[PDB]
Design a protein around this ligand. Sequence first.
Ligand SMILES: CNC(=O)c1cc(-c2ccccc2)n[nH]1
Length: 155
Amino acid sequence: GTSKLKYVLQDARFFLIKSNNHENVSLAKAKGVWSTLPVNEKKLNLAFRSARSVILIFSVRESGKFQGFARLSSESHHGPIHWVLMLGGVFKIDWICRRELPFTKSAHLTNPWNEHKPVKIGRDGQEIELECGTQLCLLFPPDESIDLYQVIHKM
Ligand SMILES: CNC(=O)c1cc(-c2ccccc2)n[nH]1
């Protein structure tokens, strides 16, 4: 069902993450980590202290799809990850959904924080307004491999 997912997303903040390649998203799914540009890293650190959940929604450039979404479990930290290419700050993340969602299925959602353009459109780090981001996450196929119980107990 969707009740625990709705609880995790309650009063959350949402950010679009754009990766150059599938390899980095695959590494993030295997290792529970993400790194981003310093300008975006500053935004995510601020948001992490500010909200009960910060959700990253991932899209590989040119894929026409989102590849899943995850919750920050830490601010960025330094001191290695073989990313394909700065990306030195490393966030810990808990995956909420590792399934894909094609952009065709989100064509009815627009992001007020990006001029009400379709939510698929935006730069890496673009914030997605609460209602848009919640509805986007709810569109993904349920990921039955994930138990949100341990996620809820970090909030
Ligand atoms: C592991 N992190 C990444 O692969 C990544 C790449 C980017 C980016 C942002 C703007 C222009 C080009 C690439 N952001 N995150």
